[PDB]
Design a protein around this ligand. Structure first.
Ligand SMILES: Nc1cc(Br)ccn1
Length: 293
Protein backbone atom coordinates (compact mmCIF):
# COMPACT_ATOMS: atom_id res chain seq x y z
CA UNK A 1 0.00 0.00 0.00
CA UNK A 2 2.24 2.91 -1.24
CA UNK A 3 1.82 6.29 0.51
CA UNK A 4 0.86 8.00 -2.79
CA UNK A 5 -2.56 6.18 -2.62
CA UNK A 6 -3.27 8.75 0.14
CA UNK A 7 -3.99 11.14 -2.80
CA UNK A 8 -7.16 9.05 -3.54
CA UNK A 9 -10.43 8.35 -1.64
CA UNK A 10 -12.23 5.28 -3.13
CA UNK A 11 -9.60 2.94 -4.65
CA UNK A 12 -11.77 0.06 -5.79
CA UNK A 13 -10.62 -2.87 -8.09
CA UNK A 14 -12.66 -2.74 -11.36
CA UNK A 15 -10.69 -5.11 -13.59
CA UNK A 16 -7.61 -7.18 -14.55
CA UNK A 17 -5.55 -5.62 -17.33
CA UNK A 18 -2.77 -6.96 -19.56
CA UNK A 19 -0.11 -5.65 -17.11
CA UNK A 20 -1.76 -5.47 -13.63
CA UNK A 21 -4.84 -4.66 -11.67
CA UNK A 22 -7.06 -1.74 -12.77
CA UNK A 23 -8.72 0.38 -10.04
CA UNK A 24 -11.34 3.11 -10.04
CA UNK A 25 -10.15 5.92 -7.79
CA UNK A 26 -11.16 9.47 -6.80
CA UNK A 27 -8.49 12.18 -6.30
CA UNK A 28 -9.26 13.85 -2.82
CA UNK A 29 -7.99 17.41 -3.83
CA UNK A 30 -9.42 17.64 -7.43
CA UNK A 31 -12.36 15.22 -7.01
CA UNK A 32 -11.63 13.54 -10.41
CA UNK A 33 -12.55 9.82 -10.86
CA UNK A 34 -9.77 8.01 -12.75
CA UNK A 35 -8.65 4.58 -13.82
CA UNK A 36 -5.43 3.57 -11.95
CA UNK A 37 -3.42 0.77 -13.69
CA UNK A 38 -0.64 -1.06 -11.86
CA UNK A 39 2.13 -2.24 -14.27
CA UNK A 40 13.02 0.01 -16.20
CA UNK A 41 14.35 3.35 -17.62
CA UNK A 42 13.60 3.01 -21.40
CA UNK A 43 9.90 2.07 -20.48
CA UNK A 44 9.64 5.25 -18.28
CA UNK A 45 10.87 7.51 -21.13
CA UNK A 46 8.58 5.76 -23.73
CA UNK A 47 5.45 5.93 -21.45
CA UNK A 48 6.02 9.55 -20.26
CA UNK A 49 5.98 10.83 -23.86
CA UNK A 50 2.42 9.48 -24.26
CA UNK A 51 1.14 12.19 -21.79
CA UNK A 52 1.37 14.58 -24.81
CA UNK A 53 -0.64 12.32 -27.24
CA UNK A 54 -4.13 13.83 -26.68
CA UNK A 55 -7.16 13.35 -28.90
CA UNK A 56 -10.94 13.00 -28.28
CA UNK A 57 -10.89 9.32 -29.36
CA UNK A 58 -7.86 8.34 -27.24
CA UNK A 59 -8.25 7.58 -23.49
CA UNK A 60 -6.18 10.37 -21.88
CA UNK A 61 -2.97 9.37 -19.92
CA UNK A 62 -3.09 11.83 -16.99
CA UNK A 63 0.04 10.75 -15.02
CA UNK A 64 2.91 8.22 -14.62
CA UNK A 65 3.78 7.29 -11.03
CA UNK A 66 7.14 5.37 -10.38
CA UNK A 67 7.48 4.50 -6.63
CA UNK A 68 8.95 1.64 -4.51
CA UNK A 69 10.18 0.00 -7.78
CA UNK A 70 6.47 -0.20 -8.84
CA UNK A 71 4.73 1.67 -11.78
CA UNK A 72 1.18 3.13 -11.97
CA UNK A 73 -0.61 4.83 -14.87
CA UNK A 74 -3.48 7.22 -14.24
CA UNK A 75 -6.00 7.43 -17.05
CA UNK A 76 -9.31 9.19 -17.73
CA UNK A 77 -12.21 6.93 -16.62
CA UNK A 78 -14.98 5.63 -18.90
CA UNK A 79 -17.86 3.44 -17.68
CA UNK A 80 -18.16 0.68 -20.32
CA UNK A 81 -16.11 -1.20 -22.96
CA UNK A 82 -17.19 -2.39 -26.39
CA UNK A 83 -16.94 -6.06 -25.39
CA UNK A 84 -19.57 -5.64 -22.66
CA UNK A 85 -21.72 -3.43 -25.01
CA UNK A 86 -21.49 -6.09 -27.76
CA UNK A 87 -22.59 -8.80 -25.22
CA UNK A 88 -25.44 -6.45 -24.00
CA UNK A 89 -26.51 -5.81 -27.70
CA UNK A 90 -26.42 -9.53 -28.84
CA UNK A 91 -30.20 -10.28 -29.28
CA UNK A 92 -30.69 -7.44 -31.83
CA UNK A 93 -27.07 -6.34 -32.65
CA UNK A 94 -25.56 -2.80 -32.58
CA UNK A 95 -27.50 -0.63 -35.15
CA UNK A 96 -25.48 -0.02 -38.40
CA UNK A 97 -25.48 3.80 -37.86
CA UNK A 98 -23.81 3.30 -34.46
CA UNK A 99 -21.32 0.71 -35.84
CA UNK A 100 -20.49 3.29 -38.51
CA UNK A 101 -20.09 6.11 -35.96
CA UNK A 102 -17.88 3.86 -33.76
CA UNK A 103 -15.65 2.83 -36.71
CA UNK A 104 -15.36 6.43 -37.96
CA UNK A 105 -14.29 7.64 -34.48
CA UNK A 106 -11.81 4.80 -33.94
CA UNK A 107 -10.24 5.55 -37.39
CA UNK A 108 -9.85 9.20 -36.24
CA UNK A 109 -8.00 8.03 -33.12
CA UNK A 110 -5.77 5.73 -35.19
CA UNK A 111 -5.08 8.47 -37.75
CA UNK A 112 -3.98 10.81 -34.90
CA UNK A 113 -1.72 8.29 -33.14
CA UNK A 114 -0.22 7.00 -36.44
CA UNK A 115 0.51 10.61 -37.54
CA UNK A 116 2.61 10.92 -34.29
CA UNK A 117 4.45 7.59 -34.93
CA UNK A 118 2.59 5.72 -32.13
CA UNK A 119 1.08 2.26 -32.53
CA UNK A 120 -1.38 0.37 -30.41
CA UNK A 121 -0.51 -3.19 -31.52
CA UNK A 122 -3.07 -4.86 -29.21
CA UNK A 123 -6.45 -3.44 -30.19
CA UNK A 124 -9.40 -5.52 -28.99
CA UNK A 125 -12.99 -4.85 -27.92
CA UNK A 126 -11.98 -4.75 -24.21
CA UNK A 127 -9.75 -1.66 -24.82
CA UNK A 128 -12.33 0.31 -26.71
CA UNK A 129 -14.24 2.39 -24.15
CA UNK A 130 -17.60 4.10 -24.68
CA UNK A 131 -19.60 6.86 -22.89
CA UNK A 132 -23.16 7.94 -22.82
CA UNK A 133 -22.66 10.80 -25.34
CA UNK A 134 -21.94 8.34 -28.33
CA UNK A 135 -18.12 8.62 -28.13
CA UNK A 136 -15.69 5.70 -28.29
CA UNK A 137 -12.03 5.88 -27.30
CA UNK A 138 -8.99 3.65 -27.64
CA UNK A 139 -7.31 2.67 -24.39
CA UNK A 140 -3.64 1.55 -23.90
CA UNK A 141 -2.10 3.11 -27.09
CA UNK A 142 1.70 3.06 -26.98
CA UNK A 143 2.00 0.61 -24.10
CA UNK A 144 3.14 -2.30 -26.32
CA UNK A 145 6.24 -0.31 -27.50
CA UNK A 146 6.98 0.57 -23.81
CA UNK A 147 6.41 -2.88 -22.16
CA UNK A 148 5.80 -5.62 -24.83
CA UNK A 149 2.64 -7.75 -25.38
CA UNK A 150 2.99 -10.92 -23.29
CA UNK A 151 1.57 -14.41 -24.02
CA UNK A 152 -0.26 -14.47 -20.63
CA UNK A 153 -1.36 -11.55 -18.38
CA UNK A 154 -0.17 -11.04 -14.77
CA UNK A 155 -3.22 -13.31 -13.77
CA UNK A 156 -2.07 -16.02 -16.31
CA UNK A 157 -5.07 -15.14 -18.59
CA UNK A 158 -4.35 -15.79 -22.29
CA UNK A 159 -3.81 -12.59 -24.26
CA UNK A 160 -6.19 -12.91 -27.23
CA UNK A 161 -4.73 -13.57 -30.76
CA UNK A 162 -8.07 -12.92 -32.48
CA UNK A 163 -7.18 -9.42 -33.69
CA UNK A 164 -3.53 -10.04 -34.53
CA UNK A 165 -2.28 -9.12 -38.01
CA UNK A 166 -0.81 -11.87 -40.23
CA UNK A 167 2.59 -10.19 -40.52
CA UNK A 168 2.94 -10.43 -36.72
CA UNK A 169 1.97 -14.11 -36.75
CA UNK A 170 4.44 -14.79 -39.67
CA UNK A 171 7.37 -13.32 -37.70
CA UNK A 172 7.87 -9.89 -39.30
CA UNK A 173 10.22 -7.91 -37.03
CA UNK A 174 9.31 -4.38 -38.33
CA UNK A 175 5.53 -4.36 -38.58
CA UNK A 176 3.93 -0.91 -38.23
CA UNK A 177 0.70 1.09 -38.32
CA UNK A 178 -1.08 -1.38 -40.67
CA UNK A 179 -1.33 -3.85 -37.78
CA UNK A 180 -3.86 -1.56 -36.10
CA UNK A 181 -5.98 -1.30 -39.26
CA UNK A 182 -6.14 -5.10 -39.41
CA UNK A 183 -7.31 -5.31 -35.79
CA UNK A 184 -9.93 -2.63 -36.31
CA UNK A 185 -11.20 -4.49 -39.43
CA UNK A 186 -11.62 -7.63 -37.38
CA UNK A 187 -13.56 -5.56 -34.74
CA UNK A 188 -15.74 -3.99 -37.44
CA UNK A 189 -16.70 -7.47 -38.70
CA UNK A 190 -17.51 -8.65 -35.14
CA UNK A 191 -19.79 -5.65 -34.54
CA UNK A 192 -21.70 -6.43 -37.76
CA UNK A 193 -22.01 -10.23 -37.40
CA UNK A 194 -22.07 -10.51 -33.60
CA UNK A 195 -19.34 -13.19 -33.71
CA UNK A 196 -15.52 -12.92 -33.70
CA UNK A 197 -14.15 -13.06 -37.25
CA UNK A 198 -11.00 -15.16 -36.51
CA UNK A 199 -11.27 -16.70 -32.97
CA UNK A 200 -7.97 -18.58 -32.98
CA UNK A 201 -6.79 -20.41 -29.91
CA UNK A 202 -3.10 -20.76 -30.91
CA UNK A 203 -0.85 -19.00 -33.35
CA UNK A 204 -1.30 -21.68 -36.07
CA UNK A 205 -5.04 -21.84 -35.54
CA UNK A 206 -5.21 -18.06 -35.82
CA UNK A 207 -3.17 -18.10 -39.08
CA UNK A 208 -5.23 -21.01 -40.56
CA UNK A 209 -8.48 -19.26 -39.56
CA UNK A 210 -7.36 -16.17 -41.54
CA UNK A 211 -6.21 -18.41 -44.50
CA UNK A 212 -9.56 -20.28 -44.69
CA UNK A 213 -11.50 -16.99 -45.06
CA UNK A 214 -9.09 -14.80 -47.07
CA UNK A 215 -7.18 -17.57 -48.95
CA UNK A 216 -3.70 -18.81 -48.16
CA UNK A 217 -1.43 -15.90 -49.03
CA UNK A 218 1.07 -16.26 -51.87
CA UNK A 219 3.54 -14.15 -53.76
CA UNK A 220 0.76 -12.85 -56.10
CA UNK A 221 -1.28 -11.15 -53.27
CA UNK A 222 1.67 -10.58 -50.90
CA UNK A 223 5.06 -10.18 -52.53
CA UNK A 224 7.75 -11.40 -50.09
CA UNK A 225 5.37 -13.48 -47.90
CA UNK A 226 7.16 -16.81 -48.71
CA UNK A 227 10.40 -15.37 -47.22
CA UNK A 228 8.86 -14.42 -43.85
CA UNK A 229 10.49 -16.09 -40.80
CA UNK A 230 7.53 -18.30 -39.82
CA UNK A 231 6.12 -18.96 -43.33
CA UNK A 232 6.16 -22.66 -44.24
CA UNK A 233 5.69 -23.98 -47.76
CA UNK A 234 3.68 -26.83 -46.20
CA UNK A 235 0.84 -24.49 -45.09
CA UNK A 236 -2.43 -25.81 -46.69
CA UNK A 237 -3.69 -23.82 -49.71
CA UNK A 238 -7.26 -22.56 -49.07
CA UNK A 239 -9.31 -20.60 -51.59
CA UNK A 240 -10.55 -17.10 -50.60
CA UNK A 241 -14.27 -16.64 -49.67
CA UNK A 242 -16.59 -13.77 -50.75
CA UNK A 243 -17.15 -11.08 -48.08
CA UNK A 244 -20.85 -11.37 -48.94
CA UNK A 245 -20.66 -14.71 -47.06
CA UNK A 246 -18.30 -13.50 -44.35
CA UNK A 247 -20.10 -10.32 -43.07
CA UNK A 248 -23.75 -10.39 -44.13
CA UNK A 249 -25.75 -8.09 -44.06
CA UNK A 250 -23.09 -5.44 -44.60
CA UNK A 251 -23.58 -3.42 -47.84
CA UNK A 252 -21.08 -3.11 -50.66
CA UNK A 253 -19.70 0.16 -49.25
CA UNK A 254 -18.81 -1.56 -45.92
CA UNK A 255 -17.60 -4.78 -47.58
CA UNK A 256 -15.27 -2.72 -49.86
CA UNK A 257 -13.77 -0.87 -46.83
CA UNK A 258 -13.45 -4.10 -44.79
CA UNK A 259 -11.63 -5.82 -47.71
CA UNK A 260 -9.15 -2.91 -47.83
CA UNK A 261 -8.58 -3.14 -44.03
CA UNK A 262 -7.90 -6.87 -44.32
CA UNK A 263 -5.46 -6.83 -47.29
CA UNK A 264 -2.64 -9.25 -46.63
CA UNK A 265 0.16 -6.97 -47.84
CA UNK A 266 0.61 -4.35 -45.10
CA UNK A 267 1.68 -1.77 -47.77
CA UNK A 268 -1.53 -2.27 -49.66
CA UNK A 269 -3.75 -2.21 -46.52
CA UNK A 270 -5.70 1.03 -46.32
CA UNK A 271 -4.41 3.76 -43.93
CA UNK A 272 -6.65 5.25 -41.23
CA UNK A 273 -6.46 8.64 -43.00
CA UNK A 274 -7.59 7.09 -46.36
CA UNK A 275 -10.30 4.98 -44.67
CA UNK A 276 -11.88 8.20 -43.27
CA UNK A 277 -12.45 9.30 -46.96
CA UNK A 278 -14.15 5.99 -47.92
CA UNK A 279 -17.70 6.21 -49.36
CA UNK A 280 -18.95 4.07 -46.46
CA UNK A 281 -18.71 7.27 -44.28
CA UNK A 282 -20.64 9.57 -46.66
CA UNK A 283 -23.78 9.32 -44.42
CA UNK A 284 -22.03 8.98 -41.02
CA UNK A 285 -23.86 10.37 -37.97
CA UNK A 286 -23.27 10.27 -34.20
CA UNK A 287 -26.18 8.35 -32.57
CA UNK A 288 -26.54 8.02 -28.76
CA UNK A 289 -26.28 4.35 -27.50
CA UNK A 290 -28.68 3.02 -24.85
CA UNK A 291 -26.29 2.49 -21.90
CA UNK A 292 -27.25 0.99 -18.53
CA UNK A 293 -24.53 1.85 -15.95
N1 LIG B 1 7.66 -3.82 -34.93
C1 LIG B 1 7.50 -3.74 -33.57
C2 LIG B 1 6.48 -2.98 -32.97
C3 LIG B 1 6.41 -2.95 -31.58
BR1 LIG B 1 5.05 -1.96 -30.71
C4 LIG B 1 7.29 -3.66 -30.80
C5 LIG B 1 8.27 -4.39 -31.42
N2 LIG B 1 8.41 -4.42 -32.77
Amino acid sequence: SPEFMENFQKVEKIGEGTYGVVYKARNKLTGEVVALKKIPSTAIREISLLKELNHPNIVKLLDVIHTENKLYLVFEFLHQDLKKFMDASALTGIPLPLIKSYLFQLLQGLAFCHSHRVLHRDLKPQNLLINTEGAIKLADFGLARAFGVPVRTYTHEVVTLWYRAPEILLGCKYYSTAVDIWSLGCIFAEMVTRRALFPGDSEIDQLFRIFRTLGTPDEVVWPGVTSMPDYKPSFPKWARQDFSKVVPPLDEDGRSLLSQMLHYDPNKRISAKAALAHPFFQDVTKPVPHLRL
